[PDB]
């Protein structure tokens, strides 16, 4: 009947809010370390300006 | 900016001390031309001591 299928299909919409947190969970977490991947842009800056010191 | 600013400053201190001892070496090498001149003059007073008709 119509009233019981409405709630389980609401759980389908309540499963896409778990994706609305997930695509700001993984994307927050993966490129937080890509911001820490710019330490390697500093590690080339120190070692190439190690030459100007040398 | 703590890696490049010290190595230019320590370059300046190294250039300062080398320029100063470039002046202090040539000035100490100015004495030994004067000190031996007073030593060579001190030798030649003793030759004046020898000849008595000039020494008396």
From Swiss-Prot, chain A:
Superkingdom to which the source organism belongs: Eukaryota
Listed Basic and acidic residues bias regions: 30-50
Compartments, record wording: Melanosome; Cytoplasmic vesicle, Clathrin-coated vesicle membrane
Coiled-coil intervals, chain numbering: 3-52
Tissue expression notes: Expressed in brain (at protein level).
Annotated function: Subunit of the V1 complex of vacuolar(H+)-ATPase (V-ATPase), a multisubunit enzyme composed of a peripheral complex (V1) that hydrolyzes ATP and a membrane integral complex (V0) that translocates protons. V-ATPase is responsible for acidifying and maintaining the pH of intracellular compartments and in some cell types, is targeted to the plasma membrane, where it is responsible for acidifying the extracellular environment.
Family: Belongs to the V-ATPase G subunit family.
Quaternary state and interactors: V-ATPase is a heteromultimeric enzyme made up of two complexes: the ATP-hydrolytic V1 complex and the proton translocation V0 complex. The V1 complex consists of three catalytic AB heterodimers that form a heterohexamer, three peripheral stalks each consisting of EG heterodimers, one central rotor including subunits D and F, and the regulatory subunits C and H. The proton translocation complex V0 consists of the proton transport subunit a, a ring of proteolipid subunits c9c'', rotary subunit d, subunits e and f, and the accessory subunits ATP6AP1/Ac45 and ATP6AP2/PRR.
Name of the protein described by the UniProt record: V-type proton ATPase subunit G 2
Organism listed in the record: Bos taurus (Bovine)
Span of the entire protein shown here: 6 to 59 of 118
Curated annotation (Swiss-Prot), chain B:
Region forming the signal peptide: none
Tissue-by-tissue expression: Expressed in brain (at protein level).
UniProt-annotated location(s): Apical cell membrane; Cytoplasmic vesicle, Secretory vesicle, Synaptic vesicle membrane; Cytoplasmic vesicle, Clathrin-coated vesicle membrane
Family stated for the protein in its record: Belongs to the V-ATPase E subunit family.
Function in brief: Subunit of the V1 complex of vacuolar(H+)-ATPase (V-ATPase), a multisubunit enzyme composed of a peripheral complex (V1) that hydrolyzes ATP and a membrane integral complex (V0) that translocates protons. V-ATPase is responsible for acidifying and maintaining the pH of intracellular compartments and in some cell types, is targeted to the plasma membrane, where it is responsible for acidifying the extracellular environment.
Quaternary structure and partners: V-ATPase is a heteromultimeric enzyme made up of two complexes: the ATP-hydrolytic V1 complex and the proton translocation V0 complex. The V1 complex consists of three catalytic AB heterodimers that form a heterohexamer, three peripheral stalks each consisting of EG heterodimers, one central rotor including subunits D and F, and the regulatory subunits C and H. The proton translocation complex V0 consists of the proton transport subunit a, a ring of proteolipid subunits c9c'', rotary subunit d, subunits e and f, and the accessory subunits ATP6AP1/Ac45 and ATP6AP2/PRR.
Name of the protein described by the UniProt record: V-type proton ATPase subunit E 1
Protein encoded by which gene: ATP6V1E1
């Amino acid at each position: 009947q119509g009233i019981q299928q409405l709630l389980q299909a609401e759980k389908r919409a309540a499963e896409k809010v778990a994706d609305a947190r997930k695509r700001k969970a993984r994307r927050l977490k993966q490129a937080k370390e890509e911001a820490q991947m710019e330490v390697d842009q500093y590690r080339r800056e120190r070692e190439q300006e190690f030459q100007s010191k040398q | 900016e703590k890696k490049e600013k010290q190595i230019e400053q320590q370059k300046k201190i190294q250039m300062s001390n080398l320029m100063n001892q470039a002046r202090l070496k040539v000035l100490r090498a100015r004495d030994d031309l004067i000190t031996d001149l007073l030593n060579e003059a001190k030798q030649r007073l003793s030759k004046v001591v020898k000849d008595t008709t000039r020494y008396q």
